[PDB]
Structure 1
Amino acid sequence: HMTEYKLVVVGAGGVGKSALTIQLIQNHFVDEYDPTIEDSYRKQVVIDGETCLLDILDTAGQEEYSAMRDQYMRTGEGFLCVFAINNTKSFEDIHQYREQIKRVKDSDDVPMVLVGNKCDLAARTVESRQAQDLARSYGIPYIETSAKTRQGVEDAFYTLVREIRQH
């Protein structure tokens, strides 16, 4: 049996966080996504030669069900804490998301990654340096991604698999 990694995307709503996982799972030249099918959240990948299966939980659109976060979060081994570079409040929300994850996994060292997503051509309010600084304070990587170009998407997820493996 190949290793299966249960990954959880957490982040503010209303800022296109769903693009991160949609872009990973859909083929780089296909734009025909159906969230209903099983293949829509499962992907077989090769990271540093070791083949694995990534199972990604993204509850995008269920943010108002705030009492379900703990439940959803406990499913995961690794977390992508996602904010939008065009929205400072989504960047300010990361601290509490991380605190919630630490509490759910009952651990100060949970495989985690900070992802800054460029969802549209709107102006950047979060400078890379501010996010690079926040990530260093938590002791985790920082990956920026673009929803239009698929740039950084694979590095965000692969970097998390390596955080789980090196735990």
Structure 2
Amino acid sequence: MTEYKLVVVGAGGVGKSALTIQLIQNHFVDEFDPTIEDSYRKQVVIDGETCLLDILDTAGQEEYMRTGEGFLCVFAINNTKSFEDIHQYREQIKRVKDSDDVPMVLVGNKCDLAARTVESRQAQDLARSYGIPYIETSAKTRQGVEDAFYTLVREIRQH
């Protein structure tokens, strides 16, 4: 059956692991270990297609992807530095993949928190400059989580 190899990248502590665990295990982790590299595999139904999601959860911490088919580029809406650092991760992707045309979604996580320091308009403008969708998420409330992963699946489908 069809398998979508997704890779989740972004700065440390933005909620990459929490988002992944919320999609795959359907619960929120309040306290998680920084990642070296972890992978999750799950059979799902998306738009009437039964498929398998292989998600690679990568390290955000600097102390640390090529087979990836689609990329979730994650920042946290209450972490300006993570947003300012997004261009880096897009660059490495275009680099390792050898393409300016790679399925990718920009994700603004922790949208449940009220200490927003990155405005939606700014992230939208960035996403449009890359030619990609922008989706805001909360791994805590599950807001936008399916939207983000499923949009990525659909971007891979269109490619």
Q: TM-score range by the shorter chain?
A: 0.7 to 0.9
116-125 or 51-60: which moved more?
A: 116-125
Once the two structures are superposed, residues 30-52 of structure 1 have per-residue CA deviations (whole angstroms, 9 ceiling, x without a partner) of: 99999999997111111111111
Shift of 1:75: 2.1
Once the two structures are superposed, residues 121-141 of structure 1 have per-residue CA deviations (whole angstroms, 9 ceiling, x without a partner) of: 351001111111111111101
Q: TM-score, structure 2 length as denominator? A: 0.87
Identity level (%): 99
Q: In structure 2, what is the Cα distance between the partners aligned to 1:34 and 1:85?
A: 21
Q: Aligned pair count? A: 159
Gap regions ≥5 residues in structure 2: none
Q: In structure 1, what is the Cα distance between the partners aligned to 2:91 and 2:157?
A: 22
Gap regions ≥5 residues in structure 1: 65-71
Distance 1:26 1:39, change over 3 A: farther
Q: In structure 2, what is the Cα distance between the partners aligned to 1:32 and 1:124?
A: 21
What's the C-alpha RMSD, in Å, of the aligned pairs? 3.2
Q: TM-score, structure 1 length as denominator? A: 0.83
Q: In structure 2, what is the Cα distance between the partners aligned to 1:94 and 1:38?
A: 19
Once the two structures are superposed, residues 102-158 of structure 1 have per-residue CA deviations (whole angstroms, 9 ceiling, x without a partner) of: 010101100000000017635100111111111111110111001220111111000
Distance 1:145 1:46, change over 3 A: same
Shift of 1:15: 3.1
Shift of 1:83: 0.2
Distance 1:101 1:127, change over 3 A: same
Q: In structure 2, what is the Cα distance between the partners aligned to 1:36 and 1:96?
A: 19
Q: In structure 1, what is the Cα distance between the partners aligned to 2:88 and 2:28?
A: 36
